[PDB]
Write an enzyme that holds these catalytic residues in place. Sequence first.
Site, mmCIF file in Angstrom:
data_model
loop_
_atom_site.group_PDB
_atom_site.id
_atom_site.type_symbol
_atom_site.label_atom_id
_atom_site.label_comp_id
_atom_site.label_asym_id
_atom_site.label_seq_id
_atom_site.Cartn_x
_atom_site.Cartn_y
_atom_site.Cartn_z
ATOM 1 N N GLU A 292 0.838 -1.173 0.164
ATOM 2 C CA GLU A 292 -0.029 0.084 0.156
ATOM 3 C C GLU A 292 0.851 1.322 -0.195
ATOM 4 O O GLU A 292 1.980 1.327 0.642
ATOM 5 C CB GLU A 292 -0.951 0.148 1.114
ATOM 6 C CG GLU A 292 -2.151 1.068 1.075
ATOM 7 C CD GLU A 292 -2.862 1.090 2.404
ATOM 8 O OE1 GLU A 292 -2.363 0.227 3.337
ATOM 9 O OE2 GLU A 292 -3.889 1.493 2.711
ATOM 10 N N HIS A 294 0.508 4.757 1.042
ATOM 11 C CA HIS A 294 -0.549 5.667 1.797
ATOM 12 C C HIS A 294 0.116 6.724 2.739
ATOM 13 O O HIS A 294 1.202 6.684 2.644
ATOM 14 C CB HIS A 294 -1.317 4.859 2.800
ATOM 15 C CG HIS A 294 -0.378 4.051 3.807
ATOM 16 N ND1 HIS A 294 -0.558 4.309 5.213
ATOM 17 C CD2 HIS A 294 0.553 3.375 3.783
ATOM 18 C CE1 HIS A 294 0.488 3.518 5.906
ATOM 19 N NE2 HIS A 294 0.837 2.854 4.914
ATOM 20 N N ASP A 324 -3.599 4.282 -2.197
ATOM 21 C CA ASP A 324 -4.260 4.935 -1.209
ATOM 22 C C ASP A 324 -4.932 6.221 -1.474
ATOM 23 O O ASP A 324 -3.620 7.114 -1.674
ATOM 24 C CB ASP A 324 -4.121 4.649 0.262
ATOM 25 C CG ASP A 324 -5.174 4.913 1.059
ATOM 26 O OD1 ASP A 324 -5.615 3.773 1.731
ATOM 27 O OD2 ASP A 324 -5.481 5.951 1.515
ATOM 28 N N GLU A 405 -13.010 3.225 0.952
ATOM 29 C CA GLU A 405 -12.503 3.019 2.674
ATOM 30 C C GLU A 405 -12.975 4.017 3.274
ATOM 31 O O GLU A 405 -12.188 5.260 3.312
ATOM 32 C CB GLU A 405 -10.958 2.668 2.550
ATOM 33 C CG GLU A 405 -10.548 1.488 2.382
ATOM 34 C CD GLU A 405 -9.196 1.135 2.933
ATOM 35 O OE1 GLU A 405 -8.432 2.027 3.402
ATOM 36 O OE2 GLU A 405 -8.652 -0.115 2.924
HETATM 37 MN MN LIG Z 1 -5.706 2.141 3.142
#
Ligand SMILES: [Mn+2]
Lengths: 433, 433
Positions: A292, A294, A324, A405
Amino acid sequence: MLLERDLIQSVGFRNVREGGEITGFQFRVRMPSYRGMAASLIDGIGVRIPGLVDVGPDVPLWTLQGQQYTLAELWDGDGVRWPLEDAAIIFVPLPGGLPDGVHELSIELRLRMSYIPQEHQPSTYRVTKHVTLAPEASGAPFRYGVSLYSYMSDYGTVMDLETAMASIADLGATGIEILGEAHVPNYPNPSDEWVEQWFALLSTYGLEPTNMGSWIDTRLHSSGPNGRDMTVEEGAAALQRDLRLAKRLGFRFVRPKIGVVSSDLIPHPIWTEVVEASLPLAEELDVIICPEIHSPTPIKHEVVDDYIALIRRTGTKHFGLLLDTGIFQDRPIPLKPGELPGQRPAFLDGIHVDPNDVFDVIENVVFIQAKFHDIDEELDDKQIPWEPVLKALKDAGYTGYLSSEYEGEREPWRSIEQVRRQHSLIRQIADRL
Amino acid sequence: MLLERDLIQSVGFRNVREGGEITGFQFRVRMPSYRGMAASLIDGIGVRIPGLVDVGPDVPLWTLQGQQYTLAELWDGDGVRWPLEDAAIIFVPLPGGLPDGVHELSIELRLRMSYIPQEHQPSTYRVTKHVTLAPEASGAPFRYGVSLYSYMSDYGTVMDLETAMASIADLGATGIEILGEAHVPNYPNPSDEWVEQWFALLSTYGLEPTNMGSWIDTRLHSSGPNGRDMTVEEGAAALQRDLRLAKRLGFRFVRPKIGVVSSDLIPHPIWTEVVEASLPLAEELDVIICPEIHSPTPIKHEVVDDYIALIRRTGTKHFGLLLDTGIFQDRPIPLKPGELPGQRPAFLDGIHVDPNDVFDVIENVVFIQAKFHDIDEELDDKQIPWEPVLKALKDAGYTGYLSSEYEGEREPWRSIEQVRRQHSLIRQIADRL
Ligand SMILES: [Mn+2]
Ligand SMILES: [Mn+2]
């Protein structure tokens, strides 16, 4: 399946099509009483949306136990019930339907209780809710999914797997993302009863599994007198165990979250030989490993360049990037009650990555977590600039998934309405482009 | 089974006995994170109750997946997990245990997240909850039960049947009361799968079914052009259908709620020939019919004397009285926000029946619904004078059930703690007598 505390349910607020024509809209109502009753005790429901709908109590139609009735048919009927475990589906006739967005829906439900004197009768329940219509917008070219992390505190307290899956299919989303160490019971060995039930629910609601989140806890044995560090063999066996469970459940992506060794979220040094040990297993099971990206890590970072360098060195098709969208946040997340500015980290004001930086790395982005915190009743996001972000993704050629999310306040049942507002907002933007 | 939003759960806060000695107390904690993790990532829990308990983070013991560990055993362990679907059972060593009542329990839970930098670690969660201890008081001569009406809006939104049954067995109650038209799915014909599952849960949690609530809706076909009144044959078939379902599920009492025809809650005139038509079926199935005596009807009333006259005329052992303790309410139910005094009925200030009036009718009272609205952290009821009420029931010779009926505000998860406070209050009063 469980219901919400509000009488008006968010799930099921759709437009209704009969023969290719939108004939009206529907919504679901929880029974306000403490019992379910026979359907002839219903004295009507009056539905009002200001400016669009204003109908009387005898105009809408009632779908109870799989069969639709008018109010006059309910009054003469026998045997039909509104059960307490079921929500009544209320069809309001409106040719053309409602537009997309959040509507201030006000109902006036009347029920006849026989044990109450006649002067105080019928029992009237007036509630008002801002509900989001299920999106009429066909947000091509993207595909739409929901991560079960969006229901973080709701899952296990107010929600189970089938209630979460029913809400995802009502948005029109086709993908579901789970965290495997949270949503698979008896991890990492679910029973054969659960796995067969999991595959039955995917075909019922028309969902395909997309991404399974994984962790490699490098501080697993850090505490105590015998405290030690995680080695490569204990670390590679953690990732290989998660790839087999994601292959068993039908997922296509695995996101491993490695532990860090510094304040800059520099990954643990074992990560590049844990991943390269598991790339033979990933190519055999055909699951893509995607770490990820992020916040506070921007795209122009040394950690991200190490992921791209690993793909060119190994030459694999089963390593990719997960994006993300919290890195594009430009306005600050509001202060929690009780804190003054300074003790929270400075990346909660947003790191403000320009959305044109996805053009550098879009050939390795396989999956995008649509991160958001707050969307109000005008479909205005408070933290993410969704329109230049989705414009840059579309022009870079992204055609994959956008999984919701929700990261906002974990008020009970708040996450159900917030994910509906995000799919309504994103699909409306993608048609405006 | 579902959990509550509070980290500290109300269900499971008990004293622990090992070999006839109370060695400590236990409580259950929901996992605060979004995932379940391996148990070696736990960095301890510090438990404090002011004046009674103050232990460090390494003192309590952890029961995870059916096995109890110390914190040092968790740090060296492998394979043991704290699953997200499970609550961890925390045993705090305290010889003698806690006293009865509501305790201000403050925990300081520490978890190690490997993806967070070391300076902000471990993750600390401090919550405080007023939890009620499971009652050590043996409240003889009464038997104790819970009606599922106490979880009115909670059932179906935050709670299912097994979660409700687990909370009843944690109080030490032995009876469960349902409303049949609310809690039996696919009423009035539940599936054979559900009935066998219902009998399995009663033997698991050690509960016996006591009372099934029923309605005779006299205004079933009152609305419309063909509006008519319910006849005796349609009314007797409603009560006979409910007696067969209560016999099928093991219940002993049926409470029919007949419709009224006046402001004084005078019953519909068909009631005395509906009941006498169903007294042959009740004696065959051995189920007692017991109509409810609830406020604004006092005990010294013409309606109540008609029930006693029916028993002496028919000579039956299967008709009885149900006593609702809302008639003993002496202090007013507080005003709902938004109303001024006058538009609510005057029996919500309590009708104030003297508790010595149960001596007239105690030979026909078979069941008592312990009605209450608010109990605070000092175990003080705000509406019902429980001590002279329970003193009069004990001296009149009542030895039956007291089923909890919570009538207070339907805030989510509020009813779980309120029923615990009532069983703790009543059992402590019955030992003081
Ligand atoms: Mn995330
Ligand atoms: Mn009652």
